[PDB]
Design a protein around this ligand. Structure first.
Ligand SMILES: Nc1ncnc2c1ncn2[C@@H]1O[C@H](COP(=O)(O)OP(=O)(O)NP(=O)(O)O)[C@@H](O)[C@H]1O
Ligand SMILES: Nc1ncnc2c1ncn2[C@@H]1O[C@H](COP(=O)(O)OP(=O)(O)NP(=O)(O)O)[C@@H](O)[C@H]1O
Ligand SMILES: C[C@@H]1O[C@@H]1P(=O)(O)O
Ligand SMILES: C[C@@H]1O[C@@H]1P(=O)(O)O
Ligand SMILES: [Mg+2]
Ligand SMILES: [Mg+2]
Lengths: 268, 268
């Protein structure tokens, strides 16, 4: 409804943290979950969750489950994808279950029950997300199989979940996507800043996976964050490490500790 | 929006079928699921689902999972109940997974992501249910842990899920609750008909469980169906049997086969 001050000096009002599947699950290993990694990440997320109570969502990568359930679905019945919803709910559960164990009010929410696709733009269609946050709880979210306006299912990566927050979050949204690289690498060298109004050089730098990636690797990652940033968010691609202290993610970007490697995406 | 003809001669426009946990899961046995029973029920539900495409929901009892996750939760943190949502999602998955296997477009939906409690009346708060049905799909639903307006979680039985349909379904709603008795037994003898405007004798007949029931056994069953029936639904309590042919549930109650035992609840 109003003028929002934004800048490297300002403190974010909302944290959307997305953790890559690959950081806790081996894609090509059915059912796999590094519990040690989950435990230790969960412990760092929980400290953030207490600071940002009702002002945070944790978004989980699909790992073996999500990439698995897309791999296997028959392409000739769009509806076989429905397995993906059951698959990514499994990962939300693991996080919530773990986070509650160390005192976080973590509640898993099924995105497919809350959000549809309407001309390719994901539409929040449930008031429950806003309510859970208002209650001071921590929504644990993930990618999903989403219905479009014609009833066809589409695989929707956890990377794009933050886009769903855009029309909902008042004030400063920060999106941090924890990944298995330090940021977008160009040339042996990571790009520190990307202007979301002209991300040309960032898109120019991406390479193709070894064919193993159902949700578009870095390209979908950049699409999502470029989309959020054009809508005001401060967005980051950085390496997730299960033991890494993340308290600085509550801090103005100006006052971030030394030698943190990231790619930041903003609409100057 | 208009005048709806209703009667024992008329054909229902919408089927809400609720199957008791006890019919496929042993409450006091953690994780248990009678696969044979699920397979065979699923097969009978699927024939209904094809007839009532986009005009049906399957509602699953919680069984070992749901009754288990309530049993175990610490009562002093209301938020421990969050386990119940992960628990009843497990059962929805099993049904959907099975139903899709024999060609049904079955999609599990998390009620807690769609519905809150507001002065004790469950409120549908997501447009997704209506949309999934409009797409011709079969929502697989269940009880859940639901947030109230103050942020406290409450255990919400599958038995009350039909109440959520009431403001949504145009025309004639039929609710069939498949259970482990033939109907409400009074006196050695089952009550054939209950007027939802004065259910006194029906409520008078209920006995207390052996203390083993977290969601109120027959009392919650009657509450839910009395609530639906006061709002126009035709409602039934009858014995679920996994091999029982259920094609007659699409038929006017007048033209139901011989010797079917049920208790019918209507607002004359
Ligand atoms: N210019 C680039 N800089 C960095 N990484 C890149 C670049 N281009 C492509 N990539 C690939 O993008 C990957 C990051 O996306 P991705 O593999 O999807 O990570 P994730 O989503 O965090 N985990 P998962 O989804 O389970 O694979 C890297 O591992 C690189 O292979
Ligand atoms: N007057 C009555 N007539 C029939 N059953 C009754 C009556 N009063 C109490 N009951 C109990 O109500 C039970 C039915 O509810 P319930 O045990 O909750 O069935 P369910 O919901 O279908 N399966 P589950 O929820 O897993 O136990 C019966 O098994 C009876 O013990
Ligand atoms: C939705 C499928 O799991 C993948 P992602 O969300 O990890 O991209
Ligand atoms: C919600 C808890 O599982 C029970 P019910 O839904 O089977 O009553
Ligand atoms: Mg990825
Ligand atoms: Mg019961």
């Amino acid at each position: 409804s109003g003028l929002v001050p934004r800048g490297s000096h300002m403190t974010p009002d909302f944290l959307a943290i997305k953790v890559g599947g690959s950081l806790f699950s081996r894609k090509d290993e059915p059912g796999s979950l590094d519990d040690d990694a989950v435990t230790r990440f969960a412990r760092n997320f929980a400290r953030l969750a207490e600071t940002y109570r009702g002002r945070m969502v944790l978004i989980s990568g699909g790992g073996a489950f999500g990439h698995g359930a897309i791999r296997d679905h028959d392409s000739t019945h769009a509806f076989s994808l429905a397995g993906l919803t059951e698959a990514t709910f499994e990962v939300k559960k693991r996080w919530a279950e773990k986070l509650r164990g160390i005192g976080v009010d973590a509640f898993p929410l099924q995105l497919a029950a809350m959000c549809t696709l309407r001309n390719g733009i994901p539409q929040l269609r449930s008031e429950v997300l806003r309510d859970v946050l208002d209650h001071g709880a921590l929504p644990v979210l993930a990618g999903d199989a989403l219905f479009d306006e014609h009833g066809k299912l589409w695989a929707f990566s956890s990377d794009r979940v933050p886009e769903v927050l855009l029309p909902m979050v008042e004030g400063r949204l920060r999106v941090v996507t924890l990944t298995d690289v330090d940021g977008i690498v160009t040339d042996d060298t990571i790009l520190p800043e990307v202007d979301a109004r002209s991300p040309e050089q960032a898109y120019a730098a991406l390479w193709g996976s070894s064919e193993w990636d159902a949700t578009g690797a870095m390209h979908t990652k950049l699409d999502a964050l470029v989309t959020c940033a054009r809508r005001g968010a401060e967005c980051f691609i950085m390496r997730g490490d299960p033991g890494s202290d993340l308290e600085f993610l509550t801090a103005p970007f100006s006052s971030w500790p030394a030698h943190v490697r990231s790619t930041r995406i903003t609409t100057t």
